[PDB]
Design a protein around this nucleic acid. Structure first.
Length: 620
RNA sequence: UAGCAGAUCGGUUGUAUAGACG
RNA sequence: CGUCUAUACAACCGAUCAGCU
């Protein structure tokens, strides 16, 4: 629990405005219309256009007055007067520019989305990487009123810049530098400093340098160093920095950008309880700092003062009478000792496996499963076990596409890295034994269910490439009231809006299988912490906590079933199904809590539907 | 790519405020 | 609104890593 409210002016914060006339040179030509506004009203103010927020409730429509600029001294339009009323999308923004004034006062910085304090950061130069001790201050409307979220985010901004990165790339070689940049630097992304932007790399200019001119906003051929010296007040040191692109030219100079522990991970990065010290420190720092608090009292910002189923028989486990494994010649020990270990794990979980027909492929490539699999696979074969050390997507899907698309047939794929572990070997075999038996169509462990006719179908959309727009990630389902029949399928359609209709085909493919074996018709991530409305303990909510009113954002349920040992608990957020079908939210909390145990790859608790320790010193 | 608890780095689509190019 | 944007709010995905069986 590291979340702190900020009270003060809950409502009624109206806004003045700032005129922007005329823009001449650059973005600074418009931004300077308030850079020299200290002579009119005072320092404590924020400018973002036609909105200049005020704590009080005055502003209605519009007005105008006069001001002055600095660089050239032309006519300046400024209107610190009536604008509009309070809107739901304004309070978050104006309190966050208040936090911007805080960074101008508390000496915080900003990276991308959230503001960080890095005046005395965690300088860890082992890999030219500096973990910023700032907090993710994503202030927004929250439980009840307004609340400031604070997680101590070790934001990984590099002290080194693209200048030295390209210089060490040159230090490797020059032609090899060019080649590797065309291989390892293209596609990669640099982090900008002057405007904290995110610019990609596709190609690197060669003849260009930080002296060649370009058609700037002024329409002249000015030098490169002059533009950055007069537009952002940043001086360029060297003149031999080749440009990058995001040939058409998108502003990118390696001079002023940057691109991309073990024992520190248990001291001051993410302890479950000891992270409350930062929750107990920054709250005091805001108040006790006279210089920082003085500029916040003017605005009106006052912060708050404060399973063992490996031994019990399984419901209905399908045995393996005749089957084969598709191991390569390099995995003779693997997928056979594992099967031999599977011959020991299976009897406790109520099934037996005979030694498979040890078929094999001819080479460690795709053009081995095309022939060897088809030659020695018949409807008399139950299980196919495919293992390989290297794991590439095309070859794995090459073996897969001959098993799932044509017809529903179980197929188990393993990798070397899954099996190399010896202490996990008994454990990994248990998951696979449950995985194979789930794919065999056999029942597995269940829970005490005070429920029935429930769906466990976990949709997953794989939308990565427009050319490969297939949405193939899996359509895991459950076709028995005990939720022990997990026969995964895949989507076989492609459409943007009519996806509501064609996704039902997989639902029908899962519901028809439900009717064919039962003869009866039956948004998962946040950065929040939950302090449930049952007991005030600012700690991990009990698994299955019921909070849906005045202790969360909206009527959507926000549940906890994901048990934590290292790090602070991050509750999972959930949408609603229906509030009129008669489903009590408490049972849906239980249903999510019970379905949490039903993922058939880990005997315990998981995040989503798809104990009395750490009291004394833990690492001391 | 047997599954995961805590995060981190990016990309993208977003969504809101407003501006300009027609 | 097609585009370019600055301010942010927000999600998903990919990968990576500080591994409860």
């Amino acid at each position: 629990a590291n979340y702190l409210p900020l009270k003060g002016n809950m409502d009624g914060v109206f806004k003045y405005a700032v005129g922007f006339n005329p823009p001449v040179e650059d973005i600074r030509s418009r931004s300077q219309l308030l850079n020299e506004h200290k002579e009119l009203i005072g320092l404590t103010r924020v400018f973002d256009g036609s909105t200049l927020y005020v704590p009080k409730r005055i502003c209605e429509q519009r007005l105008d007055l006069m001001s002055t600029r600095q660089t050239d001294g032309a006519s300046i339009k400024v209107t610190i007067s009536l604008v509009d009323s309070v809107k739901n999308r304004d309070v978050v923004q104006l309190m966050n520019v208040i936090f911007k004034r805080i960074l101008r006062s508390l000496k915080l910085q900003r990276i991308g989305r959230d503001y960080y304090d890095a005046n005395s950061p965690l300088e860890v130069p082992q890999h030219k990487m500096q973990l910023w001790p700032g907090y993710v201050t994503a202030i927004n409307r929250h439980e009840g009123g307004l609340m400031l979220v604070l997680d101590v985010s070790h934001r990984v901004m590099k002290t080194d810049t693209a200048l030295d990165f390209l210089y060490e790339l040159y230090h490797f070689n020059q032609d090899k530098f060019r080649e590797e940049a065309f291989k390892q630097l293209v596609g990669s992304v640099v982090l900008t400093r002057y405007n904290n932007r995110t610019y990609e790399i596709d190609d690197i200019a060669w003849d260009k340098n930080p002296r060649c001119a370009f058609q700037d906003h002024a329409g002249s051929q000015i030098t490169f160093v002059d533009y950055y010296k007069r537009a952002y007040d940043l001086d360029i040191t060297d003149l031999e920095q080749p440009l990058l692109i995001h040939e058409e030219m998108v502003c990118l100079v390696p001079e002023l950008c940057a691109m991309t522990m073990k024992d520190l991970a248990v001291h001051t990065r993410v302890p479950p309880e000891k992270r409350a010290e930062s929750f107990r420190k920054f709250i005091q720092r805001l108040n006790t700092t006279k210089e920082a608090s003085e500029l916040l009292h003017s605005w009106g910002l006052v912060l708050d003062s404060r399973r063992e189923c490996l031994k019990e028989h399984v419901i209905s486990a399908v045995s393996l009478l005749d089957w084969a494994v598709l191991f390569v010649r390099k995995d003779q020990g693997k997928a056979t000792d594992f099967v031999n270990m599977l011959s020991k794990v299976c009897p406790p979980i109520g099934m037996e496996v005979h030694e498979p027909k040890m078929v094999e492929v001819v080479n460690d490539r795709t053009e081995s499963y095309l022939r060897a699999l088809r030659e020695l696979i018949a409807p008399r074969l139950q299980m196919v076990v495919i293992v390989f050390p290297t794991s590439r997507d095309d070859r794995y899907s090459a073996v897969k596409k001959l098993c799932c698309i044509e017809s529903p047939i179980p197929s188990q794929v393993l990798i070397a890295r899954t099996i190399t572990q010896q202490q996990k070997l008994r454990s990994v075999a248990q998951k696979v034994a449950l995985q194979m038996n789930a794919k065999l169509g056999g029942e597995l462990w269940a829970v005490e269910i005070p429920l029935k006719s429930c769906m466990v179908v976990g949709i997953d959309v794989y939308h990565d490439k427009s050319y490969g727009n297939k949405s193939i990630a899996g359509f895991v389902a459950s076709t028995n009231p005990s939720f022990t029949r997990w026969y995964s399928r895949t989507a076989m359609q492609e459409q943007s809006q009519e996806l509501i209709h064609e996704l039902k085909l997989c639902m029908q493919a899962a519901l028809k299988k439900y009717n064919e074996m039962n003869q009866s018709l039956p948004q998962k991530r946040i950065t929040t912490r939950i302090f449930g409305r049952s007991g005030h303990s600012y700690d991990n909510p009990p698994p299955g906590v019921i909070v849906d009113h005045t202790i969360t954002k909206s009527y959507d349920f926000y549940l906890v079933s994901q048990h934590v040992r290292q790090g602070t608990v991050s509750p999972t957020y959930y949408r609603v199904i229906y509030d009129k079908s008669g489903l009590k939210p408490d049972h849906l909390q239980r249903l999510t809590y019970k379905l949490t145990h039903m993922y058939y790859n880990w005997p315990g608790t998981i995040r989503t539907p798809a104990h009395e320790l750490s009291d004394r010193l833990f690492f001391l």
